[PDB]
Every structure is written in structure tokens, then in C-alpha cells.
Design a protein around this ligand. Structure first.
Ligand SMILES: [Ca+2]
Ligand SMILES: [Ca+2]
Ligand SMILES: [Cl-]
Ligand SMILES: [Cl-]
Lengths: 496, 496
């Protein structure tokens, strides 16, 4: 469950948040694959509730109605097509498994669901699964409201409803089998792994129990004995009885400390600065590197009230986003995931985004297709950070320097750093307010390297900055505190 | 060190942030004392640096220059006068001890100091103490910058400089004696205890070592064997090697989880709601009640980037501030402290308050006196939350119900709660968006009680809401979701 199952060098997976299958299919073939991306974190592919108030939320997909692969992204047919096509290009698909609950109990009974299955939350009836009264933890939960009231009572966290969300009774085999059936169905199609949603609200043991019921990856794209890659969403920044570690037995864990801290350091808040990043990794109190799944921002927290808080850097602050993402990708710690969002009428009001609920760009609740522009950017309001050059090349930079150790770190006791990955890469940062000039030991073979940030190496030449390295490995760098991008990166493949 | 040393029933101490001695003297006599306040947390009474950039900060008082009781609040003469006068009315004085460091090392040498003592930070010379090179942890600190670089290395946290702040060598006896001398000087004047600043950056043992060198409270106002009340500033919300508990041996600890969480619950963020507050206290993972020192907001975090984050409620959001403060005071857990701030040109910019550095209201760096208006409010820009009726009476409510157990808790599985303190008090809350009507068991003797929130009991009558309780203890309540104050509180002394 620890192996990504990616294909050939590929070190990172992108989350094409709320995208439609037909669009990820294409995206895979036309970009993802040729641009070295490992895989795609898809949105909950199961039939969910249709929330009309507010209008079609970004979170209605985390409120299950059945396990029919039939969401706003498409139907099973379209879904299979995507996996098949993406797999044919070495781009893995990772399904967002929503398995601790169904929809909110308050929700009105009816057919208001992405696939039209009937369902009555008040009576606990989900005929399309099927689930019923005794398949939910109603009895088991010890709280007065039946809701999670105190995150200090590890037990009520897993046995009670998260925000009123009907908590499936995962202790029962009927339920574990129904879920395993769902996840196995996916696997048979060609899935490479999952993102176990709300892992904190599930007993590690239950998650294991369920995982153990899984088949092996489809012999048609994976080797014999391939195990579904498993990363579980657990938000643990201390202060709670439940610890990320509690889940290492099932697979990787989402390290939310990573993105939080990094952002705090890039934003230069709380006296933090980049020179303090010498021992970035387990050194800053982060879960063991090969049990971690990192990212700067994830779909949820990029909206402000996630784990990190206002400190989380998102696409909105591009100049600093690109940097934090660049640093992350360049550093060896954890397994990386890059975000790819969509734009929305962000309107802050005393502390909150009154619109952080807004769903994907659409036309009367119908998700807009992702259109590509001659300059490789997207249309219809899809941000497409994964297509940005500064990130894209760094997504590749990671690939190129894979396996190489962290070294040749330099700092100016401020915000001007730089470090390399063995002899295949080097990256230099300047988050200070004064031009950065100095000759650094790049630990790279002599030659002329193209900065894959300001440009690329095309037809034997750089389109951006050129860096000159000499036998002794040294090279001079110059990054103005107001440069387009205050950081430069070079690697074995960007050498002329 | 655990006993507050307060006087007769008095359960809470107010922090008259940045106030001048002459003003606290008066305040004590004219208000504090008659209104049942226990004590006052004064600002660092020692000579500090004079920061002209930005102009006279709220934090220059946490950057020591000598131990001369001579700050912007006044001179020793004025200081003694305050203590003497306040003590004469049963109002204790608690000094903010700034003892882990002096000023920042970067600071220019000179006499730019509240009392004019000379001092050279670069050479480590504080002739007015006196301290010198070997009296600071310069050697001891293992980091490269000499600054605290990783809060995951408990040891460098106490041996290295906090934000460049020269870290006093508290391992040495010369230093412990110099500090003890300072704290003992204070005690001889009439101090009741302290607030040990930056306790996290000091070894529990050092703090004990220093405390042990202290005399006993002045026999002129305290009983024989009175021990200085000790509450240490330690910000611990988990995730770190250093734990609040690590200091229980010295005295109480600032529980920052309290204010954070409560605010999150009142703001109705992260699915939180008041009905979940059944077992508020150690039940929510908080440090042992009689080792805790609670508050909603403290001088630091009320500015946003403190422990709690944007979740911390301050005077700015009065409607919700009053409630959180009311709940806190009404609930038995921990020893309470109420904040009293001053207004400032708050200007937010992408995440931060570009003015959270602004000092107290003034006239060319001279602190403005605190003026009182006919309606009991303050002038010259001093907020004076401690004078607000909703708080003031609750500060007394605590006194009245002292010793009584938590009971008769009620919730509507939402935000409409209520609970009582034995048979001397009852409080009802409505933080829901719909009028609150219901007959609750107040566990109070039958009679007609005045709501000490909407009004008072004066000359045998209520000036605000009247609550009618019958023998059976029941009483009806009605709080509109848009009432002036969405919570009502009654107690033994507000009965006609
Ligand atoms: Ca659960
Ligand atoms: Ca220290
Ligand atoms: Cl996630
Ligand atoms: Cl404090």
C-alpha cells in the first residue's frame, strides 16, 4: 500500500479537482503523460447527493448516495474510458474513496442525486447499495447529539457523525464487504490506489479490515502482486489523542504539517525564514518520509479554514505559490501531490469566504469542459496550476533527480537559500528583499544549464536564463528580489 | 505558587494592558475593588528599550534593558504607590516578569531606554544590572544562527535566542540571583505573584531554581507563608516536545487551547457548536483545572497571529466576545483572567495586521492617561472591556457562584445551551439563528432574579430583564437570536 504504482521515474500525482472524466482522459494523453506526471487524484466517482442550497457545492461529492460510478464528472462508461486511456499512457488514476459516511442526516429523502437513486436519510435508507438502519453507527455513538462533539474523545470521533453525516458502521462485515466491493470494482477497472477520505473518523483496524478485502491491481497494467497505493486523509498537527502514526499500518498519510509550516516560512510569518529550512523533513517533526504524502495546499484548506489556516499558500498568491511548490518538489521528503483548482467568486467577510462553498465552473449545475488555449493555459475558469511552466518543469525536476540525496545546502542566515539533489539537480531561492548574487557549488557536471523556471531547453538552446557551471562544480547566480520568479532550478536534462 | 492570593471571594484578575501606574491606582479604588476584581496583570515594570522603528511598540516592553522599575507606565515611586493603593482595597498586583532575555541583539547601543540606562547589545553589556558577555547563553546555544531554528529541539528552544533576543544564561547562579533580586524587590513592594514570560524558552528547573530564591509575600497584606502566585506563559497546543505539564511544578500554566477552541465554537467554525460543550474542561483535553490559567484572548493573540489564529475572539467582535467571556467566567474550569485592551488603526493586508505593532494611545510616545466618562466608559482610545456591563457582572457572577459545581446543563443539539453553578447561579445561551423559548431547571431558590447581563438589581428592582423562578426550580427563558445580548445570567445576589 506504500508503493505509488506510478510508471517509470514519475514522482508526482496531480489532483484534477472536480474535473470530468472525458477531460482527464484527454489531459492525460495530451499533457500529463508527455509531461511526466505520475497520476491523477480524481474526485469521488460515486453517486452523491445533489445539493441545491447552496447550488451544487464543492462538498456534495463527499456526501454519498450509492456506489454507482455516476457523478457530475460522468458515468461508468466515461469513467472506464478515462482510466483505460490514462493507463495506456503511464498516468495512474487514484480514486477519492468516500467510505466513512453517506450524506448528512438532515438531507431530504428523494432522488436528488447525481444518478437519480432514491434515498431517505432520516430513515437511513439507501436502497441502491443497499444500506439500512443497522448499517450505521447510530447505536454505537455515545454522544448526546450523535454528532462528534469533542475531538478529545478518540472513540466518539469514529463512532459519531461528522457534521451530521450518517456514519457508516464499519465494524460490521456487511458494510466492509459493500465498501470493498466498491473499491474492488474500481480496481478491476484499472485504479492504482486511493485517497481514504476522513480516515480520522475510522478505526485504523476497520480501514485495514476493509483494505485486506481488496483484490490485486489489474494484471493488465500493473505487475503481479501490485498493491493499491493507499494514502489516508488524516489532519494531525498535534493536540489530539489520535495521531497520524496510528494509520501507518494501512499505507501513507497526509502530512498536513508540511504545507502549513512551509507556507508560514514562505510568507515570512512568525519570524520564520528559508535559512531555517536546513533540515526540512522528519527534522521539523514530520512523519517518516516514506509514510508521508505531501502537498502545499489541498482542495479543502486552499479555501482558508483548512488545517494550515490563512498560512496556506494557494494559486491566488502565484508568485509565492510557485516557490513553495518548487521547493517542495525539489526536496526529497515525502511523496508529492500537486493541486489543480478552479476559480470562484471569492468574497471574504470577517474571517470567512462566504463563497468557499461554490462548486466547479458550470452551466446550470453542469460542469464546464476544460478547454485548452494556444498558450497551454485553460479556459472556462479552470486554473490549471499543473500546466504553469514554473510548476510543470519542477514536477519533472523531481523525476530527473529521483533517488539523489539532499546536499550542497546554502543559506544567508536570511531568506536566500539553495540546495541540490546529488549530481542531477540544483535549485536556488531568493525570498529576501535584495538581489541575490553569489557563486554556489552546484555539485553538477560542468556545462551550460537552462533554468527550467524562467524557460526551457528547446532545440539545443535555453529560452530562459542560462546557468554556466565549471568542472569544480561552482556557478554564479543572480536573482533580483523582484525577478519574475525569485528562484532558479537546473538539472541533468536541461543541460545543452 | 498555585494560590492566587486574591482577597475574599474574588475569582478573576484583569490585565490592564500598557496602562500607567497612576491610572491603575485610581482604577483599583474607583472600580476594580468595588466591582469585585481580584487583581491586575501589569505590564513589564522594568526599564526596557525604546524602539523608534516602528514608533514605541507594544513589544518594546518585552525587550529588557535593566531591572529599574522605570517604564512608560511610571517610575518606582509611582509604581509603589499603585501597589500600596491597590492592595489597600483588596486588589492584587501581578507583575509580568520578563526574565528569559534582554533586548534584541541587533538593537543599537546607547541610552534609548525608558529610564536612560546605557546598554550595548552587540557587546552584551547591560551596566545597569549588571550583565555582560558570559551572562548570556551565546556559547551554550548549538544552532548556526544562535536563534531558535526548530521548535522540535526542546533544547535549542531554551538555549538559543528567541527572535534574536539575547537569551540570558539562566543556568548560572549570578543570573538567577540577579533575577530573584528583581522579583524579590517587587515582592517587598506588595506584589502578589507573576506572569513568567516566555516560560517555554526557559528550563522548568531554572524557573524553579529562580523561584526558590524568592522571599514570602509582604507580611503587610498577605498571611504568613503566602507564596507568590505563579502562572507561566507556555503556548502548547500539542505537536511539540515541550508540554505545558512540564511546568506544573512551578505553578499554573497559560492554557492556550481554552481560548482557541471556545472561539472556534462561538464563531461556529469547523462544525463546532455550543451543545458540544457538555464536558467543557479537562474533558476537552485541557490541562488539569487547578494548574490552568484561562482567558479568551490575551494581549498577544488578540492581534490575529497568536496561538489560536483568526479564531481568537477579541473586543472587535463584541457581541460574540461578551458571550465567550461570559461562558468562560460562568464555567468552573481554570483560574480566569479578563483582558482590557486599547484601540489601534487595525489595517489588514493579505493575512497580517500591518499595524499590530502599534503601541498604546499616546502623545509623542507618552502614554495617554485613562479617562472615565459619565457612562463608565473610557476615553483616550482605551477599550476598557472590563468596564462593560456584560463582562463586569459576569466577573462578579463567578465570585458569587464560587465553589458551586457545574450542573443542570441543557442543549438543543445545536447552539442553544444553559447550565448552572450549584444553587447560586444559572446562565442560558442562544447562539442559534432562531429565538430561544423554553422552561429550564435553574436549580435556584424560587424568587424573582435580575438578569445581570441586560441590566442590574438596583434599589430592590431590575433595570434589565426579570427572570421568574418557582419552588420546583424551573423558570422560562426567551432569547431572540437577535437580542441585544443572546445570553442571560442570574445568581444569588441578583435576586430581589
Ligand atoms: Ca466514523
Ligand atoms: Ca531561553
Ligand atoms: Cl487531501
Ligand atoms: Cl499570557
Amino acid at each position: 500500500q506504500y508503493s505509488s504504482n506510478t510508471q517509470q521515474g514519475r514522482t508526482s500525482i496531480v489532483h484534477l479537482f472536480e474535473w470530468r472524466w472525458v477531460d482527464i482522459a484527454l489531459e492525460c494523453e495530451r499533457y500529463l503523460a508527455p509531461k511526466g506526471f505520475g497520476g491523477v487524484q480524481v474526485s469521488p466517482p460515486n453517486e452523491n447527493v445533489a445539493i441545491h442550497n447552496p447550488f451544487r457545492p464543492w462538498w456534495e461529492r463527499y456526501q454519498p448516495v450509492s456506489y454507482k460510478l455516476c457523478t457530475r464528472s460522468g458515468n461508468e462508461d466515461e469513467f472506464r474510458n478515462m482510466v483505460t486511456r490514462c493507463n495506456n499512457v503511464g498516468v495512474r488514476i487514484y480514486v477519492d474513496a468516500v467510505i466513512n459516511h453517506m450524506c448528512g442526516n438532515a438531507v431530504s429523502a428523494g432522488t436528488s442525486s447525481t444518478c437519480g437513486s432514491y434515498f431517505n436519510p432520516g430513515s437511513r435508507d439507501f436502497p441502491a447499495v443497499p444500506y439500512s438502519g443497522w448499517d450505521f453507527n447510530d447505536g454505537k455513538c455515545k454522544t448526546g447529539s450523535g454528532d462528534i462533539e469533542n475531538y478529545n474523545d478518540a472513540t466518539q470521533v469514529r463512532d459519531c457523525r461528522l457534521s451530521g453525516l450518517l456514519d457508516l458502521a464499519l465494524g460490521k462485515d456487511y458494510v466492509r464487504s459493500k465498501i470493498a466491493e466498491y473499491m474492488n470494482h474500481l480496481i478491476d477497472i484499472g485504479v492504482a490506489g486511493f485517497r481514504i477520505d476522513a480516515s480520522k473518523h475510522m478505526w485504523p483496524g476497520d480501514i485495514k479490515a476493509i483494505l485486506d478485502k481488496l483484490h490485486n491491481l489489474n494484471s493488465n497494467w500493473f505487475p503481479e502482486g501490485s498493491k493499491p497505493f493507499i494514502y489516508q486523509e488524516v489532519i494531525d498537527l498535534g493536540g489530539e489523542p489520535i495521531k497520524s502514526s496510528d494509520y501507518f499500518g494501512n499505507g501513507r498519510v497526509t502530512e498536513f504539517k508540511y504545507g502549513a509550516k512551509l507556507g508560514t516560512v514562505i510568507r515570512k510569518w512568525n519570524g520564520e525564514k528559508m535559512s531555517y529550512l536546513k533540515n526540512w523533513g522528519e527534522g521539523w517533526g514530520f512523519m517518516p518520509s516514506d509514510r508521508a504524502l505531501v502537498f502545499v495546499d489541498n482542495h479543502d484548506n486552499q479555501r482558508g479554514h483548512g488545517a494550515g489556516g490563512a498560512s496556506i499558500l494557494t494559486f491566488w498568491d502565484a508568485r509565492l505559490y510557485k516557490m513553495a511548490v518548487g521547493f517542495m518538489l525539489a526536496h526529497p521528503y515525502g511523496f508529492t501531490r500537486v493541486m489543480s483548482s478552479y476559480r470562484w467568486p471569492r468574497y471574504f467577510e470577517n474571517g470567512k469566504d462566504v463563497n468557499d462553498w461554490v462548486g466547479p465552473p458550470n452551466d446550470n449545475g453542469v460542469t464546464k469542459e476544460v478547454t485548452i488555449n494556444p498558450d497551454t493555459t485553460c479556459g472556462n475558469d479552470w486554473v490549471c496550476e499543473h500546466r504553469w511552466r514554473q510548476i510543470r518543469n519542477m514536477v519533472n525536476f523531481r523525476n530527473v533527480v529521483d533517488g539523489q540525496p539532499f546536499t550542497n545546502w546554502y543559506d544567508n542566515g536570511s531568506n536566500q537559500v539553495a540546495f541540490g539533489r546529488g549530481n542531477r539537480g540544483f535549485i536556488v531561492f531568493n525570498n529576501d528583499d535584495w538581489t541575490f548574487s553569489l557563486t554556489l557549488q552546484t555539485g553538477l557536471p560542468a556545462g551550460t544549464y537552462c533554468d527550467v523556471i524562467s524557460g526551457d531547453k528547446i532545440n539545443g538552446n535555453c529560452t530562459g536564463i542560462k546557468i554556466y557551471v565549471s568542472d569544480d562544480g561552482k556557478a554564479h547566480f543572480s536573482i533580483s528580489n523582484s525577478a519574475e520568479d525569485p528562484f532558479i532550478a537546473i538539472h541533468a536534462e536541461s543541460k545543452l
